[PDB]
Amino acid sequence: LEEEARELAEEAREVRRRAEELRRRAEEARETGEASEEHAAALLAEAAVLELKAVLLELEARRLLKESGGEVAREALELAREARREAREALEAAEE
Amino acid sequence: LEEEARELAEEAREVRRRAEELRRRAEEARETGEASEEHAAALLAEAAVLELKAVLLELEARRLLKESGGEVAREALELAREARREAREALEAAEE
DSSP states (O other), rough: OHHHHHHHHHHHHHHHHOOOOOOHHHHHHHHHHHHOHHHHHHHHHHHHHHHHHHHHHHHHHHHHHHTOOOOHHHHHHHHHHHHHHHHHHEEEEEEO | HHHHHHHHHHHHHHHHHHHHHHHHHHHHHHHSSSHHHHHHHHHHHHHHHHHHHHHHHHHHHHHHHOOOOOOHHHHHHHHHHHHHHHHHHHHHHHHH
């Protein structure tokens, strides 16, 4: 089970960093004012999907914490939550 | 100055993720014995360097917080500490 939590955590690290990248692209986009509707909607789309992946990873970590209850499942839950939060920020930054 | 903290933050996100990639490689290698002495010493060297980079970004964040106790500078210091900590885990894993 600790190996399942390790794959959950590492997958969360991936979606966090990718949300971090998308958020930066969206923040630079609002400050630049580049109203490339294709680019604005593409970032919005990939940020929305990244969030749904983060929510799925989140609830899967909750399930892996119902069972067991170890620190490795606990850390995998925080990393999923952070990824969810970074994705919601990339979301709201893409709306503008 | 708030743009400087954004750059110090984004740089800390890169160092964090790279420490996450290095650490996973070292744990996977410590678990098995596949790591050659070249590779084991290579992961350690880039992790040690990555650690020093994370200490420099941390201290630069402590300076930025000293100059202005802004929330943007605060989160950048948190991200640098996180990168520092992830780098140190990559160090200890590469020792084995």
